[PDB]
Design a protein around this ligand. Structure first.
Ligand SMILES: Nc1nc(O)c2cc(C[C@@](O)(CNCC(=O)N[C@@H]3O[C@H](COP(=O)(O)O)[C@@H](O)[C@H]3O)c3ccc(C(=O)N[C@@H](CCC(=O)O)C(=O)O)cc3)ccc2n1
Ligand SMILES: Nc1nc(O)c2cc(C[C@@](O)(CNCC(=O)N[C@@H]3O[C@H](COP(=O)(O)O)[C@@H](O)[C@H]3O)c3ccc(C(=O)N[C@@H](CCC(=O)O)C(=O)O)cc3)ccc2n1
Lengths: 209, 209
């Protein structure tokens, strides 16, 4: 079970994945870590774990197509069974999505379909939401990004700051992302016809419940 | 690509495999190492590499069936895509072979079908063979042990001690076992109907040539 993780920053989710592989909770290994930002601390987490790292900077390519062409080329050297987006903040082209159809995962910090874009925590707090959360989903060419596999909700209280909420959501992420990856590694989770199936059961719109 | 290696001694072949996974020559990872001997140095090589180790001593079991039942139970916790026998000096039962059918590899220190048993080096020298070598094969419940995938031959000269020939063959082992495993990891090597196939072609009785 070869895992390739794509990141853009801190890498706390990447770390939770690395940790779960080490305990064998995830019966697999992170073979390589890719980042579109050279200064991402996630690259350091990978280097300290003895994991191969690669960085592709946008300015080194003259088109989004060329960038993804090289990205696919480099990722495939590791023969990934699953490609995991963990804080990767760069849109992946349809060609990339198709190439890894059914084996591309993403984690989005909101209770989809709400706040499908950027600044999710900011929006939750400013709109005074009572609940917030995160969603792990299969990435497809669909307009909504793909079928949700699992969500985690967290309460939002009056005094909470954006950092308070962000950290609270990330704690859930560190738990559900490795869990979802373990379901995939175990062959229990599969994507088919733009739908997520767990243990042969078609999952509802907001994931396993 | 999860690899589980079974050993009984030194572990030099295990090391060559670990090294090839590290360089990504083998697009996979050794997830666990099993030994039927607590004193095997190979276990130290594994521990130093941060690889989970397990030892199953024969005296702790009252039947070959019970021993293999536990071995299967423990190996499966790592969800191996390939089980690699590298110096494992204990016969595996038909149930074990069947359980890992098509994904069980072994390396034998002789140019099969010659000297299919023990003390191969001793025999090659005593009979005055001008050639000796090693054979990697898929393990099946057949009388010959399974289809040969690849062999490596070494010349034998007058004046060579059993230690000389053994070391010479060992050098070839370290080259061909990781190669064969890389072919399996790349999806190029498959076992179909007790025969070995590389790139869709049925391999010769004595392996790839
Ligand atoms: N085909 C496809 N489909 C999706 O659904 C994608 C989903 C994402 C993630 C995200 O929705 C943010 N949605 C995901 C998100 O916010 N991820 C959160 O990250 C944290 C990481 O924590 P950690 O590092 O401690 O683990 C975690 O808590 C995790 O939940 C998304 C979308 C667009 C852009 C973007 O327009 N980028 C511009 C550049 C912008 C700029 O740099 O200025 C571009 O030109 O491509 C960036 C991110 C990225 C690529 C995708 N690609
Ligand atoms: N079903 C099945 N089929 C096969 O073909 C098997 C093939 C083997 C390997 C071997 O042929 C030795 N043939 C293989 C062999 O000699 N391996 C060589 O080892 C070196 C390791 O180097 P390294 O450690 O530095 O990497 C390398 O150069 C490598 O090629 C074989 C045969 C019989 C016995 C045995 O009768 N054992 C008794 C007694 C056990 C005891 O005393 O405890 C038993 O009761 O089971 C053991 C090994 C083991 C289990 C098998 N099981």
């Amino acid at each position: 079970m070869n895992i390739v993780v794509l990141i853009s920053g801190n890498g706390s989710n990447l770390q939770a994945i690395i940790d779960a592989c080490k305990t064998n909770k995830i019966k697999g290994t992170v073979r390589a870590v890719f980042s579109n930002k050279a200064d991402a601390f996630g690259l350091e987490r990978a280097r300290q774990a003895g994991i191969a790292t690669h960085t592709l900077i946008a300015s080194a390519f003259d088109s989004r197509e060329a960038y993804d062409r090289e990205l696919i080329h480099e990722i495939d050297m590791y023969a990934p069974d699953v490609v995991v987006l963990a804080g990767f903040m760069r849109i992946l082209s349809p060609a990339f999505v198709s190439h890894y159809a059914g084996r591309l995962l993403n984690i989005h910090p909101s209770l989809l379909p709400k706040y499908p874009g950027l600044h999710t925590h900011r929006q939750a707090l400013e709109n005074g939401d009572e609940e917030h959360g995160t969603s792990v989903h299969f990435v497809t060419d669909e307009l909504d990004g793909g079928p949700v596999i699992l969500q985690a909700k967290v309460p939002v209280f009056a005094g909470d700051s954006e950092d308070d909420i962000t950290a609270r959501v990330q704690t859930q992420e560190h738990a559900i992302y490795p869990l979802v990856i373990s379901w995939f590694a175990d062959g229990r989770l599969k994507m088919h016809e733009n739908a997520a199936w767990l243990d042969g059961q078609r999952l509802p719109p907001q994931g396993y419940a």
